[PDB]
Subunit: 254 residues, 3 copies
Amino acid sequence: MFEARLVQGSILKKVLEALKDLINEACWDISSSGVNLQSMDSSHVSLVQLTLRSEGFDTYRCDRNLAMGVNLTSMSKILKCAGNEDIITLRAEDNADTLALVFEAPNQEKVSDYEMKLMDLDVEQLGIPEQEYSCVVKMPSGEFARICRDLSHIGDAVVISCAKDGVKFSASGELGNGNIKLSQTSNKEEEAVTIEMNEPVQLTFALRYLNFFTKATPLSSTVTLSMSADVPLVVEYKIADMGHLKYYLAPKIE
Amino acid sequence: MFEARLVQGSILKKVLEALKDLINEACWDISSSGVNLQSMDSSHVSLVQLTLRSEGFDTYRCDRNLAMGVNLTSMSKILKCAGNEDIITLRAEDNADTLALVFEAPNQEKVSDYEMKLMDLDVEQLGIPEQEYSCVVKMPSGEFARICRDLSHIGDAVVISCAKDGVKFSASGELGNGNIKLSQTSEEEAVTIEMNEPVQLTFALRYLNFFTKATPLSSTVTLSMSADVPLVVEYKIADMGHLKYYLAPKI
Amino acid sequence: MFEARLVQGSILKKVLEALKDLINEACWDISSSGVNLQSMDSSHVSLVQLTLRSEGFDTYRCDRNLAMGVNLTSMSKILKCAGNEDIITLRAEDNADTLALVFEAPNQEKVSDYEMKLMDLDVEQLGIPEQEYSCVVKMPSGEFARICRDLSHIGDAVVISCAKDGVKFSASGELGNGNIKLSQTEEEAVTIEMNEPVQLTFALRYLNFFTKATPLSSTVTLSMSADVPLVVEYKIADMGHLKYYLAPKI
């Protein structure tokens, strides 16, 4: 039997809003350490890696490890039926082919109860080579969202250039070029930009895919980009006090 | 000569939004007792019944019993031209084939008047019986809207089961099935159940989500159910009249 | 080398929102007096004239006059990359075929730096003959915008009746007709400089393009006369104006 209770229901709503369009179907690896998802996008280019640690749940109890195949688009629609301040509880038996989802209200006079059919999936977990990185920019998620959206109307590709003073995002297409430049900051609040830099890095990335990652933006005030040459970029969102949601993306070659 | 003058113009705007895409043509029944409207939707599944009593207007006056037919799309387009705290005066003079709408702003600087054309309609007054029902459930309207909206993700129909403890809503479809449950309370956000016998009926959410366009008119809604008879979703237009929606259960 | 620095960048974002759908391509006249743009619309019905005097730029330099052709849609997309509180700075070289724009966040350590392509353009500069007007109305920009938006549902053309008491807007179509009548006189204040009474007809389709300029000003002026086009002026305060000229029906 599996039964994880989560008081911040919104966390789960937000995660599935991020992923549903990027990935159609995925295998939710449950264990006593918690919930994990790892999958490539429909078009096999970006890797996604969710970690919800069991510590982070109010109540958690998994006995056997599960490998629940889920249509995320389906799971998303059901999470719409939860309010943002609802307490959510997931639950499952081994020889049932159904994840159950229970939404308790904050007024506490309403209780929703859904049952989501699962599916059988053909999933490998790839090796994410756990690394140290040349550059690691930590900045506001809203700002990075802005930068990625704005440059989409200039070009298809962004060149991230990382140095000690700051980071630069650049793009080129049919109507000109553009050049966004952020510097390190602060003594002011958590709208702060910071860099832990070992070597300079310059890498080109697909803006189409980065704009898919930024659907995660409402999880976290801040976002960490980690880079090194000839290895994937890691856009990371802390699901604070619980885990993270990481998008991996390889740069372009020439 | 007809002339009603409503201070809460908003009430008139809200009613037209609740109707205009459920119904494209209907006959307004004007009288000394107030304004009534009875109609069925474009495709004959649901029956709407409006009531706005003469007492509920500021000024009220009706010489004869007019029956003006109105393209509701065109009328809603005119009520777009009125602000929310505007004062709406309806007026029809003798044998002109047109309804006038006058808008006066709360500041009173701006004054706007509109001449809408009428159309000839085929009036069969299906005056369905004033029944008394097995279960009568009284609950927040916005809560009722959320429930109908959500369960559409799940399926095409909603099963409304009723009891003394609480009302229950259920739906099934391709992706799985769902089951929302409202328990009874001990004043404005209160949930209450006048239950003679237990009920369990099944309705098309498509139509329920047309009814809930009427949710601006009231903080609460009263659902009325009985076996093999039509459901009544009633938004009160408080101290003024009501707006009832009728819908039959499924095969 | 030209270089104009505007602290209220938003002005420029708003100007291009008010123009991009009405005119696709346009020629910007850069001189020591400021920035001017005069051009006819897509379908050759209405004239637009923009002025931004050099005084209103917090820094301004122009060593030689310029005629930059600009695809206003392209430019509208580049300006979308600027925050409402950014300091925008236009800049052009001796004789390059690019305009450089520079967006600086007022405080927060962010400079965006764009470079837009230009294009060759033979446009006919039409001299605007300065006229005396019979009526000139001053009303709230947002109320004129509300009116042309509302009457759009009733008919395709609006009749503007200007008396000393107030000003009347009317429209007729299939579904019916409507009148909106405004008195004379606070912030929302209608006020009329009346010489001779006027009543003229105008395409609402074009008015509702002009009113996209509404974010530039709390007030808007209408200036009418018979056998001569309507002037819808939006003041870009302490700087210049955006004027739309439109000829009437019949």
